[PDB]
Amino acid sequence: ESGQSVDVCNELEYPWKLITANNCIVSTDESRQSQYIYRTFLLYNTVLTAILKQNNPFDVIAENTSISIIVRNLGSCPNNKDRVKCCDLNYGGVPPGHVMCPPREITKKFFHYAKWVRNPNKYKRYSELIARQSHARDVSQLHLLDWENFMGEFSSYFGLHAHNV
DNA sequence: CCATTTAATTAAATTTTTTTTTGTTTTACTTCTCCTAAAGGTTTTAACGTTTGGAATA
Numbered sequence: 001e002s003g004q005s006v007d008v009c010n011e012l013e014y015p016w017k018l019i020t021a022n023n024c025i026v027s028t029d030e031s032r033q034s035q036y037i038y039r040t041f042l043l044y045n046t047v048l049t050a051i052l053k054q055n056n057p058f059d060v061i062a063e064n065t066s067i068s069i070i071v072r073n074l075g076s077c078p079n080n081k082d083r084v085k086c087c088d089l090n091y092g093g094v095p096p097g098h099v100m101c102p103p104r105e106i107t108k109k110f111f112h113y114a115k116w117v118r119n120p121n122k123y124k125r126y127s128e129l130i131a132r133q134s135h136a137r138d139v140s141q142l143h144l145l146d147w148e149n150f151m152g153e154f155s156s157y158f159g160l161h162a163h164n165v
Numbered sequence: 166c167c168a169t170t171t172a173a174t175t176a177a178a179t180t181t182t183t184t185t186t187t188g189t190t191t192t193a194c195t196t197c198t199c200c201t202a203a204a205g206g207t208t209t210t211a212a213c214g215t216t217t218g219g220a221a222t223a
Contacts, residue, residue, distance in 0.1 A: 126213095134216080
């Protein structure tokens with residue numbers, strides 16, 4: 001009851017809603033974290049594309065593309081192996097090196113969440129994917145910790161307040 | 166005181182006829198079955214993702 005609950009998937013007018021309702025799903029905190037990670041890594045991909053003097057392999061949503069093979073291509077970042085070796089990439093701006101090296105399993109679960117889009121109607125098959133507890137509690141919570149570490153260090157790297165989420 | 170007869174009538178087997186019944190045949194509607202179509206739900210396949218061993222390394 002508390003807060004603004006008027007935003008419901010019954011967004012028609014009294015009779016027309018009485019006839020049919022908007023397509024909708026169940027939202028829960030864990031899928032919300034999945035979405036946060038998703039949007040933030042979309043932002044990260046956009047910034048890479050912007051400062052890149054080469055293509056951005058992390059920007060292709062095709063099928064045969066697999067985060068596994070791309071990871072195998074690029075590999076763990078030197079000063080932090082949990083990250084990825086984006087330091088060697090080619091930027092039109094001066095290479096910041098390690099600065100652009102996100103974690104590993106975070107990107108894995110990001111890609112698996114992304115490949116959801118093929119059939120959104122099977123929403124639950126990936127609704128929670130990134131932050132799933134499939135112990136695994138430690139694994140996924142520390143993955144969230146690593147992701148938010150990347151988020152904050154990026155934000156500080158460009159003066160962005162951590163509160164802009 | 167009355168026996169005579171025949172004249173009219175009936176009765177009856179006989180004939181012939183007409184009908185009536187029986188089996189025969191032909192043909193048409195009549196149900197009985199299927200074929201056909203539609204759609205739906207049930208099953209079959211597939212895909213991804215999960216978790217787990219398999220192999221090698223630090």
